[PDB]
RNA sequence: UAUCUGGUUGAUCCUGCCAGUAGUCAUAUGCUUGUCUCAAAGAUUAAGCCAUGCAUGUCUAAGUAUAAGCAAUACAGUGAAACUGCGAAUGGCUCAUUAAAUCAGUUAUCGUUUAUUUGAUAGUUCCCUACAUGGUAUAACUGUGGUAAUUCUAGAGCUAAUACAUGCUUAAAAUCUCAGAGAUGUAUUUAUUAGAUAAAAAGAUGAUUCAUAAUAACUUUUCGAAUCGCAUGGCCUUGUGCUGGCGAUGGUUCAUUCAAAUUUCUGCCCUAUCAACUUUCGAUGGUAGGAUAGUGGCCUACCAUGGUUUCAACGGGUAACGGGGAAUAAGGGUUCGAUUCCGGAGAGGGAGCCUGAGAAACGGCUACC
RNA sequence: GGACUUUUACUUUGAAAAAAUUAGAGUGUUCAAAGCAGGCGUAUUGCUCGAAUAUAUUAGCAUGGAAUAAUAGAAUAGGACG
């Protein structure tokens, strides 16, 4: 009570993020920004628990104060800053690039894109209302309020932005059939069409996927991200390619290297 | 606070600071024997005022202070020693006899426990009293 | 404050204290294998206890479960991995049967006993103890 | 040694609760009101200081009086602070007025001055006029991106108008 | 609700829906209805009565978001609200078997609806419109 | 604090409960302002989230509405007459939102003589070509005409003088005005 | 990982308990104690009391430097004190209270406030300064001081701002308004209007009084940059003219994020040697207002007579904070959970309140005990 | 889209049930309790697999089933069908 919380104690934190038990006992938490605090993922994080450029926290705040970073192109100095689905990363050195995606078991993933390509983000429109003058106006899944957008764009939907400023170039719409992403639920991470809408109003909307090999599931639509038309990825992928395999299936694979 | 006592006294050799490895050692002990004698810590060591007491880390030789955390080893008197075969100090004559005696119990019968332990607590107020 | 370590306890103690056919069983497998408390046999019977709670666990889901085959090969993957398990034994509840001898057996302390090398398992586990 | 409260009107002692006015604010922080003792506004035996202010003076000169002559200690520092600090107009454009200061310590000795504020001066002025250009391009570009707009009200307005 | 509407002291009326003593369209008294939404319609004597109650789901400034109910009406005994029974059985997992139970639930009635005791009626969940009340009638089966 | 919690407050079976946790101050509420007629007087006060809010206490000048006509001229208030909560406001001439008052009104006449001009109850050139043009717009009431031969007009509030410190009402018309009517002179 | 044995008889078979047996992240305590790893720990009794010390302060290129501080041609480095800003509403501790309360899961805000982050977003202002307004003022400091005494403060003399208080600076069209001078933003508040969306003839939603726009006026007139730091490029008609770039701080609104406040369904241990309870003083509901951030008997006026209960209300008890969880487990169960996470409550007991986006705060203030 | 399938119980599946704990796959912490690490070779300017999975009872949500068990369907037809 009497306001907002500024810590968080580890096991507190979300399981994406994969920190020790033991370790230290508070886990970083995630500033202010664009995604939530649960889907975020904090610059700390990124810097030192999977590229390992970082090993101190004192590290990061001493590698980001360089200006060596930059995420949708703005620099982003606060250690503890947000970062989430769809944003891209751009360093200083090391002329490399990365966009935020999730592998298949539902956590953030390493993957890196060209220096070009890395130009343009996606985001899903939440929130389509008229701005005051009449300005219309979309909201994506990053904070973002882009004016005079494509009418009949609508909710739901998603939009290529250039990044240069808030740009929308094309935009996919939400219909059967388009290329998805599932952000939330057991199923978090999968890849794979769209084969039904439940309309289930006043309630979820549930909606039913179909992936390459043929397997059903539903996901109620607020974990779901349309991706583009099917076999042509409007973005750059990681290798794993989202498809989700069984518990029997993945040890195999491992035996085949011997 | 209530019924603690500094133990109170001389350094005559050697240094005392706050936690140590001190041999107590009553008036019974003997270099040979296992008798009055523990060793314990030294809580911490202070130099006396009039209330004040201001607290310190250690102290030389031949000089006044009080200790801590020692006085429930104490009955009335003792030697502190950190030698493995330091003899005990002798036993301050004195003039005067614990030879005036008087007779007490509690008033209300359920105080008899807080009268017995408060008799021990009386007898090292007072470097006489039996 | 900072997480809980876990921990388990390792052994389990009989429940009839002094049944004479227990106590001579028990000490038959500490001379031959050279033990010196029964914790050392009871670490082994609650292993094996602990062992045969998820085999018959596991019997009693119908063939074509993917959990049985899973942990199935899981377990015997581990048991023929250690010699505990002969390599034939392999299939599937042959497990239900081990006593805690095919433990000992593949001890440390034996196998320096069995392979030449010790003259006597009491002289196997010293000549481990000491580097 | 209580003080005396600027109007109170009593010849007694009391007490009141203090906001950030005449004897409290400090020392405790962010109001935090107090409650202080004070005394009155009228006069009485059991003082011991009165403080009195000079305002004439009469025949006989007094030693605390007249040769006691202490100095204002700082000098103006915002530019019409200055300016009207002895009538120079907007047309004067001190830093050759603001007074300076000597001390000497190892014989370079040169002066301290205190830095005029309220300072005509680029980049004030170009500051002032990247402002007021900011105001335009921004606004220029927003009513000129808002016609680019309306011109989908053309073709969206001609897949319902030229659809026959 | 009766004696037109204006029994109450205060003048009775829909607010900013305008009576507008200027043009004679002789309905003569506009009337603000809605449809409720999640398929039950306004009914007709919604539509054509005269009566206020700033609670009703299509005449009122009142909305229907959350769980919809169905309780069977126990008591028809207060104005413009009543209480319904519903009843179900609690399962005590030791024994294996149910028992019994059943909450009140007092819901707003708007004057739309001739309700008798006895009528399993249906309820929908609306903004807390009085201390008990967080629930508002639809149908009659 | 005035609390507004229901945690004091018998639960609907008729049992009383305990106090958990005390009054918290984000279930506040303030004492009424209680506002008068004259002298304007609003004080700020300072609502949570830093929100200011206008107190009136002692109003006069209150804008209004026709509307009708959608009119809105600042007039005089000069007492009230009826209220539907108790008629101890109308005796302490106290305004609230739904009282009902009595307003100067001249500033209505001296537009009516201005868009149209006839008036009640006994310079160029650009609206003399829409003077006339305006016809029909004319009818009053009897109910509201018969009112300027008094001078005050009889109008009720719609605003909230203790949140919005400004008090602007409407002016009572149809059975709105049949039904105030019916009981100012049936307490008469 | 599905086990029983001793004890009633002269003997028997039973019932049936006492005793035995095994575990306990279960406290205590006795004897004994070499190595390594791990690591609970003033919960229970007394949410009893506390000596001393510490536990919250904070500075950048970028709010204010004339330290009579250091180091050497308005200022310029470094920089105590003070102002200003921000924080102190998190953390940590404890479990006293609390039994439909808290809490868990599951809903709701078409019922609200929201610092901050992030993203969008703002040409208009006079009824005689804009090359830049006032002291509408003062700290530190100088100096005169009171008191046994406190992080007490007075009296006199200076001077800053992103402190406080102000307020002028504009095009280009149109709409009005007297062959053409001025008024036209935004927010406060009201009322009316559109917000179509079922064929032939004179935007969103399950749903809205939604978003948004329009008219007519209102206001003690809200915000609409007199702020900083780094740079100095361009212009010729070569003048403190005119221009201009990368940043910092701030502001109205909307969105967002961290939040929060309410909130729908279902679920609590023992007790009838608790069977009726609630409503004069709000009990359940109705209209109206008041109040709130906002719904609501939250409160007030008026009215009505309602609301709960044997499917256990109400009352009593708890050596009761809820929960995830712990112990024992053939299966079913039994016993616990003050305590590493989550939620909640409290800071000797009560109440009150200032500040602030946020507290009914306690390492804040006020009062009583 | 305009009128409802009388309406419930039960049961199948799915999403839901924070993390830790538990169960449990992987990994020579030298074993082990653990931990979520780690694994393959060059006199060095790299390569690479993991951080699973499950039971997470209720109540609610979505759903397939239509036995079992209730319940309404016209009898003063005021009834279905147009
Ligand atoms: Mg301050
Ligand atoms: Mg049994
Ligand atoms: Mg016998
Ligand atoms: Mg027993
Ligand atoms: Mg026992
Ligand atoms: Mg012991
Ligand atoms: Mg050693
Ligand atoms: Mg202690
Ligand atoms: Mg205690
Ligand atoms: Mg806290
Ligand atoms: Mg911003
Ligand atoms: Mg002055
Ligand atoms: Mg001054
Ligand atoms: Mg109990
Ligand atoms: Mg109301
Ligand atoms: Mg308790
Ligand atoms: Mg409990
Ligand atoms: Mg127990
Ligand atoms: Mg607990
Ligand atoms: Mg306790
Ligand atoms: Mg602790
Ligand atoms: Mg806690
Ligand atoms: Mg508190
Ligand atoms: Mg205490
Ligand atoms: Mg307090
Ligand atoms: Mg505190
Ligand atoms: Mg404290
Ligand atoms: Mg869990
Ligand atoms: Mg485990
Ligand atoms: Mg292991």
Same mark, same amino acid.
């Given at each position: 009570?009497?306001?907002?919380?500024?810590?968080?104690?580890?096991?507190?934190?979300?399981?994406?993020?994969?920190?020790?038990?033991?370790?230290?006992?508070?886990?970083?938490?995630?500033?202010?920004?664009?995604?939530?605090?649960?889907?975020?993922?904090?610059?700390?994080?990124?810097?030192?628990?999977?590229?390992?450029?970082?090993?101190?926290?004192?590290?990061?705040?001493?590698?980001?104060?360089?200006?060596?970073?930059?995420?949708?192109?703005?620099?982003?100095?606060?250690?503890?800053?947000?970062?989430?689905?769809?944003?891209?990363?751009?360093?200083?050195?090391?002329?490399?690039?990365?966009?935020?995606?999730?592998?298949?078991?539902?956590?953030?993933?390493?993957?890196?894109?060209?220096?070009?390509?890395?130009?343009?983000?996606?985001?899903?429109?939440?929130?389509?209302?008229?701005?005051?003058?009449?300005?219309?106006?979309?909201?994506?899944?990053?904070?973002?309020?882009?004016?005079?957008?494509?009418?009949?764009?609508?909710?739901?939907?998603?939009?290529?932005?250039?990044?240069?400023?808030?740009?929308?170039?094309?935009?996919?719409?939400?219909? =059967?059939?388009?290329?998805?992403?599932?952000?939330?639920?057991?199923?978090?991470?999968?890849?794979?069409?769209?084969?039904?809408?439940?309309?289930?109003?006043?309630?979820?909307?549930?909606?039913?996927?179909?992936?390459?090999?043929?397997?059903?599931?539903?996901?109620?639509?607020?974990?779901?991200?349309?991706?583009?038309?099917?076999?042509?990825?409007?973005?750059?992928?990681?290798?794993?390619?989202?498809?989700?395999?069984?518990? =029997?299936?993945?040890?195999?694979?491992?035996? =085949?290297?011997? | 606070?209530?019924?603690?006592?500094?133990?109170?006294?001389?350094?005559?050799?050697?240094?005392?600071?706050?936690?140590?490895?001190?041999?107590?050692?009553?008036?019974?002990?003997?270099?040979?024997?296992?008798?009055?004698?523990?060793?314990?810590?030294?809580?911490?060591?202070?130099?006396?005022?009039?209330?004040?007491?201001?607290?310190?880390?250690?102290?030389?030789?031949?000089?006044?202070?009080?200790?801590?955390?020692?006085?429930?080893?104490?009955?009335?008197?003792?030697?502190?020693?950190?030698?493995?075969?330091?003899?005990?100090?002798?036993?301050?004559?004195?003039?005067?006899?614990?030879?005036?005696?008087?007779?007490?119990?509690?008033?209300?019968?359920?105080?008899?426990?807080?009268?017995?332990?408060?008799?021990?607590?009386?007898?090292?107020?007072?470097?006489?009293?039996? | 404050?900072?997480?809980?370590?876990?921990?388990?306890?390792?052994?389990?103690?009989?429940?009839?204290?002094?049944?004479?056919?227990?106590?001579?069983?028990?000490?038959?497998?500490?001379?031959?294998?050279?033990?010196?408390?029964?914790?050392?046999?009871?670490?082994?019977?609650?292993?094996?206890?602990?062992?045969?709670?998820?085999?018959?666990?596991?019997?009693?889901?119908?063939?074509?479960?993917?959990?049985?085959?899973?942990?199935?090969?899981?377990?015997?993957?581990?048991?023929?991995?250690?010699?505990?398990?002969?390599?034939?034994?392999?299939?599937?509840?042959?497990?239900?049967?081990?006593?805690?001898?095919?433990?000992?057996?593949?001890?440390?302390?034996?196998?320096?006993?069995?392979?030449?090398?010790?003259?006597?398992?009491?002289?196997?586990?010293?000549?481990?103890?000491?580097? | 040694?209580?003080?005396?409260?600027?109007?109170?009107?009593?010849?007694?002692?009391?007490?009141?609760?203090?906001?950030?006015?005449?004897?409290?604010?400090?020392?405790?922080?962010?109001?935090?009101?107090?409650?202080?003792?004070?005394?009155?506004?009228?006069?009485?035996?059991?003082?011991?200081?009165?403080?009195?202010?000079?305002?004439?003076?009469?025949?006989?000169?007094?030693?605390?009086?007249?040769?006691?002559?202490?100095?204002?200690?700082?000098?103006?520092?915002?530019?019409?602070?200055?300016?009207?600090?002895?009538?120079?107009?907007?047309?004067?454009?001190?830093?050759?007025?603001?007074?300076?200061?000597?001390?000497?310590?190892?014989?370079?000795?040169?002066?301290?001055?205190?830095?005029?504020?309220?300072?005509?001066?680029?980049?004030?002025?170009?500051?002032?006029?990247?402002?007021?250009?900011?105001?335009?391009?921004?606004?220029?570009?927003?009513?000129?991106?808002?016609?680019?707009?309306?011109?989908?009200?053309?073709?969206?307005?001609?897949?319902?108008?030229?659809?026959? | 609700?009766?004696?037109?509407?204006?029994?109450?002291?205060?003048?009775?009326?829909?607010?900013?829906?305008?009576?507008?003593?200027?043009?004679?369209?002789?309905?003569?008294?506009?009337?603000?209805?809605?449809?409720?939404?999640?398929?039950?319609?306004?009914?007709?004597?919604?539509?054509?009565?005269?009566?206020?109650?700033?609670?009703?789901?299509?005449?009122?400034?009142?909305?229907?978001?959350?769980?919809?109910?169905?309780?069977?009406?126990?008591?028809?005994?207060?104005?413009?609200?009543?209480?319904?029974?519903?009843?179900?059985?609690?399962?005590?997992?030791?024994?294996?078997?149910?028992?019994?139970?059943?909450?009140?639930?007092?819901?707003?009635?708007?004057?739309?609806?001739?309700?008798?005791?006895?009528?399993?009626?249906?309820?929908?969940?609306?903004?807390?419109?009085?201390?008990?009340?967080?629930?508002?009638?639809?149908?009659?089966? | 604090?005035?609390?507004?919690?229901?945690?004091?407050?018998?639960?609907?079976?008729?049992?009383?409960?305990?106090?958990?946790?005390?009054?918290?101050?984000?279930?506040?509420?303030?004492?009424?302002? &209680?506002?008068?007629?004259?002298?304007?007087?609003?004080?700020?006060?300072?609502?949570?989230?830093? &929100?200011?809010?206008?107190?009136?206490?002692?109003?006069?000048?209150? &804008? @209004?509405?026709?509307?009708?006509?959608?009119?809105?001229?600042?007039?005089?208030?000069?007492?009230?007459?009826?209220?539907?909560?108790?008629?101890?406001?109308?005796?302490?001439?106290?305004?609230?939102?739904?009282?009902?008052?009595?307003?100067?009104?001249?500033?209505?006449?001296?537009? @009516?003589?201005?868009?149209?001009?006839?008036?009640?109850?006994?310079?160029?050139?650009?609206?003399?070509?829409?003077?006339?043009?305006?016809?029909?717009?004319?009818?009053?009431?009897?109910?509201?005409?018969?009112? @300027?031969?008094?001078?005050?007009?009889?109008?009720?509030?719609?605003?909230?003088?203790?949140?919005?410190?400004?008090?602007?009402?409407?002016?009572?018309?149809?059975?709105?005005?049949? @039904?105030?009517?019916?009981?100012?002179?049936?307490?008469?």
């Amino acid at each position: 009570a009497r306001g907002p919380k500024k810590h968080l104690k580890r096991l507190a934190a979300p399981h994406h993020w994969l920190l020790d038990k033991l370790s230290g006992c508070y886990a970083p938490r995630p500033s202010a920004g664009p995604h939530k605090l649960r889907e975020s993922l904090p610059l700390i994080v990124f810097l030192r628990n999977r590229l390992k450029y970082a090993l101190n926290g004192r590290e990061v705040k001493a590698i980001l104060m360089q200006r060596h970073v930059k995420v949708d192109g703005k620099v982003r100095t606060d250690t503890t800053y947000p970062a989430g689905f769809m944003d891209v990363i751009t360093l200083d050195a090391t002329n490399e690039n990365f966009r935020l995606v999730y592998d298949v078991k539902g956590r953030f993933a390493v993957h890196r894109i060209t220096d070009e390509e890395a130009s343009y983000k996606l985001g899903k429109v939440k929130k389509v209302q008229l701005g005051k003058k009449g300005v219309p106006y979309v909201v994506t899944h990053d904070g973002r309020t882009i004016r005079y957008p494509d009418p009949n764009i609508k909710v739901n939907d998603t939009v290529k932005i250039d990044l240069a400023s808030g740009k929308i170039t094309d935009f996919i719409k939400f219909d =059967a059939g388009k290329l998805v992403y599932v952000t939330g639920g057991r199923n978090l991470g999968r890849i794979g069409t769209i084969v039904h809408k439940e309309r289930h109003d006043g309630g979820f909307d549930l909606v039913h996927i179909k992936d390459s090999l043929d397997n059903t599931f539903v996901t109620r639509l607020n974990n779901v991200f349309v991706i583009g038309e099917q076999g042509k990825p409007y973005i750059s992928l990681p290798k794993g390619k989202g498809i989700k395999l069984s518990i =029997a299936e993945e040890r195999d694979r491992r035996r =085949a290297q011997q | 606070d209530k019924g603690r006592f500094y133990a109170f006294g001389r350094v005559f050799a050697g240094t005392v600071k706050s936690g140590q490895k001190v041999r107590i050692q009553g008036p019974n002990y003997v270099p040979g024997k296992k008798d009055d004698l523990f060793i314990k810590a030294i809580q911490r060591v202070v130099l006396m005022m009039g209330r004040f007491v201001e607290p310190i880390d250690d102290c030389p030789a031949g000089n006044i202070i009080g200790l801590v955390g020692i006085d429930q080893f104490l009955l009335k008197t003792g030697t502190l020693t950190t030698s493995e075969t330091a003899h005990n100090m002798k036993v301050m004559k004195f003039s005067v006899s614990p030879v005036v005696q008087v007779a007490v119990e509690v008033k209300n019968a359920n105080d008899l426990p807080k009268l017995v332990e408060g008799l021990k607590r009386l007898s090292k107020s007072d470097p006489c009293v039996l | 404050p900072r997480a809980p370590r876990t921990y388990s306890k390792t052994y389990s103690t009989p429940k009839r204290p002094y049944e004479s056919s227990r106590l001579d069983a028990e000490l038959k497998l500490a001379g031959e294998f050279g033990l010196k408390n029964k914790k050392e046999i009871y670490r082994i019977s609650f292993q094996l206890s602990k062992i045969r709670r998820a085999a018959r666990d596991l019997l009693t889901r119908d063939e074509k479960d993917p959990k049985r085959l899973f942990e199935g090969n899981a377990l015997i993957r581990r048991l023929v991995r250690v010699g505990v398990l002969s390599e034939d034994k392999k299939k599937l509840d042959y497990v239900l049967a081990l006593k805690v001898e095919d433990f000992l057996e593949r001890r440390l302390q034996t196998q320096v006993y069995k392979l030449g090398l010790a003259k006597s398992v009491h002289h196997a586990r010293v000549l481990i103890t000491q580097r | 040694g209580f003080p005396m409260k600027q109007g109170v009107l009593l010849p007694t002692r009391i007490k009141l609760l203090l906001t950030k006015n005449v004897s409290c604010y400090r020392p405790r922080r962010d109001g935090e009101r107090k409650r202080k003792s004070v005394r009155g506004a009228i006069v009485g035996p059991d003082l011991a200081v009165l403080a009195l202010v000079i305002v004439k003076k009469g025949e006989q000169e007094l030693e605390g009086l007249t040769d006691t002559t202490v100095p204002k200690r700082l000098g103006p520092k915002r530019a019409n602070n200055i300016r009207k600090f002895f009538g120079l107009s907007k047309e004067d454009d001190v830093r050759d007025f603001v007074i300076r200061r000597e001390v000497t310590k190892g014989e370079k000795t040169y002066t301290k001055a205190p830095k005029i504020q309220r300072l005509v001066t680029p980049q004030r002025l170009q500051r002032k006029r990247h402002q007021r250009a900011l105001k335009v391009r921004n606004a220029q570009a927003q009513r000129e991106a808002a016609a680019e707009y309306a011109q989908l009200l053309a073709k969206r307005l001609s897949e319902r108008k030229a659809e026959k | 609700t009766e004696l037109t509407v204006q029994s109450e002291r205060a003048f009775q009326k829909q607010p900013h829906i305008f009576n507008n003593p200027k043009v004679k369209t002789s309905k003569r008294t506009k009337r603000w209805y809605k449809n409720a939404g999640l398929g039950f319609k306004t009914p007709k004597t919604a539509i054509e009565g005269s009566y206020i109650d700033k609670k009703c789901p299509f005449t009122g400034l009142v909305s229907i978001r959350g769980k919809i109910l169905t309780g069977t009406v126990v008591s028809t005994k207060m104005h413009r609200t009543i209480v319904i029974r519903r009843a179900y059985l609690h399962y005590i997992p030791k024994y294996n078997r149910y028992e019994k139970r059943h909450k009140n639930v007092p819901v707003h009635v708007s004057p739309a609806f001739r309700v008798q005791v006895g009528d399993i009626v249906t309820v929908g969940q609306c903004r807390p419109i009085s201390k008990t009340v967080r629930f508002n009638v639809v149908k009659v089966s | 604090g005035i609390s507004r919690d229901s945690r004091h407050k018998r639960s609907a079976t008729g049992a009383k409960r305990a106090q958990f946790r005390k009054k918290r101050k984000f279930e506040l509420g303030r004492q009424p302002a &209680n506002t008068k007629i004259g002298a304007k007087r609003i004080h700020s006060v300072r609502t949570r989230g830093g &929100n200011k809010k206008y107190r009136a206490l002692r109003i006069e000048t209150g &804008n @209004f509405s026709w509307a009708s006509e959608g009119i809105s001229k600042k007039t005089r208030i000069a007492g009230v007459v009826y209220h539907p909560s108790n008629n101890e406001l109308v005796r302490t001439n106290t305004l609230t939102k739904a009282a009902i008052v009595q307003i100067d009104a001249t500033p209505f006449r001296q537009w @009516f003589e201005a868009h149209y001009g006839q008036t009640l109850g006994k310079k160029s050139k650009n609206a003399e070509r829409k003077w006339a043009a305006r016809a029909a717009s004319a009818k009053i009431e009897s109910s509201v005409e018969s009112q @300027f031969s008094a001078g005050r007009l009889y109008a009720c509030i719609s605003s909230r003088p203790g949140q919005s410190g400004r008090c602007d009402g409407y002016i009572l018309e149809g059975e709105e005005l049949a @039904f105030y009517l019916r009981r100012l002179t049936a307490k008469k």
